[PDB]
Amino acid sequence: GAMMPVPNPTMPVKGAGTTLWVYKGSGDPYANPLSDVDWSRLAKVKDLTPGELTAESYDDSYLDDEDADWTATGQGQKSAGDTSFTLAWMPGEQGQQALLAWFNEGDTRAYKIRFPNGTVDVFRGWVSSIGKAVTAKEVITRTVKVTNVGRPSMAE
């Protein structure tokens, strides 16, 4: 593309407050984290791009046979499922130390972004896209993308 400095023209209409939140601790992590008070907002997310993983992972693939007793089970640690989302920092908001610490730490994290439909998407991994923030019209903007650790680059 062009990789221009300024942010793209297209943008979400001002109406819904889209923002991702991060939770930690223990106990019902994905089941119902809303209960615990680990809820910690990071910042406002302009948009979210739920990319694919193209991995060998899948939902519960249980299956009985001869009345087995967990003699054999399938489970892999395939790490694939990056998440590209745009961010924005307003004059008087919070999240700077969050991002800086995120990249500075270099560790995996579990966060989720709320959709305008009233639902929520849970995604994990470590942020790989963290550098400088673009300032325009007294408004800061920066595109963050979380890339997990898996296979190397494509084959030519």
CATH of the domain at 111: 4.10.410.40
Task: State which approach was used to obtain the coordinates.
Answer: NMR
- Name the 3-class secondary structure at 105: helix
What are the structure tokens assigned to 53, written together? 């993983």
> In 59-80, which positions are buried (b, 16+ CB within 10 angstroms) versus exposed (e)?
eeeeeeeeeeeeeeeeeeeebb
The residues facing 20 across adjacent strands are 43, 113
Number of domains in the chain: 1
Q: What is the DSSP letter of 53?
A: -
Give all strands of the β-sheet with 109-114 in edge-to-edge order.
120-125, 109-114, 19-22, 40-49, 83-89, 139-146, 134-136
Q: Which of 10, 11, 44, 40 is nearest to 24 (CA)?
A: 40
Which amino acid appears at position 33 of this protein?
P
Residue 27 sits in which domain range?
A: 1-156
